[PDB]
Amino acid sequence: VNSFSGYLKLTDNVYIKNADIVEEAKKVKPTVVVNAANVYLKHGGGVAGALNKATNNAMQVESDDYIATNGPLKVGGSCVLSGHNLAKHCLHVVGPNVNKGEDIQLLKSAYENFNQHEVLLAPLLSAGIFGADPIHSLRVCVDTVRTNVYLAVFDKNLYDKLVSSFL
Ligand SMILES: O=C(O)[C@H]1CN(c2ncnc3[nH]c4cc(F)ccc4c23)CCC12CCC2
């Protein structure tokens, strides 16, 4: 039993809710919140900008030190950093950005990072400003992640479309 509430169950291990991931994180304080990161951990907009803003820019300060030490992530890769006031940990995961021409096959590799964590609160990778089809992202999620994932979908219209079209 965990503290996630109001989710629709899609599969044995994937759950979904129309929610603001920032507000959801603030209330649940999950062990892991996933950020829709880029390879530079520049949290300017989308989910990343919202999560970073909610940390009063502490996520960005920590991220800049991480990059200065380690260099950029790989597309499809991840790193674990602090969850600040939102979660114990933040798993920064880089899905491919279609608006940069990145290979969508890397979306499966991106979701594989979730399997290193027993339970996660997450957005749909490569959705939103990353330009991928969220229905495709949900399919890859379900077919790749084996651990327990609670997906927060900000847009109510998209949430309804994702549920109604789910196979
Ligand atoms: O979920 C969606 O409907 C959109 C938007 N996003 C998010 N997903 C969950 N929580 C969110 N909180 C946010 C606060 C913001 F300022 C901006 C975006 C998000 C956000 C990221 C892109 C997507 C996920 C599927 C396409």
Swiss-Prot record:
Inhibited in vitro by GRL-0617. It comes from the Viruses. It is found in: Host endoplasmic reticulum membrane. It catalyses: Thiol-dependent hydrolysis of ester, thioester, amide, peptide and isopeptide bonds formed by the C-terminal Gly of ubiquitin (a 76-residue protein attached to proteins as an intracellular targeting signal). Changing S164L: In strain: Gamma/P.1. Residues 1-167 form the Macro domain. This is Papain-like protease nsp3. It comes from Severe acute respiratory syndrome coronavirus 2. The chain holds residues 1025 to 1191 of 7096 of the full protein.
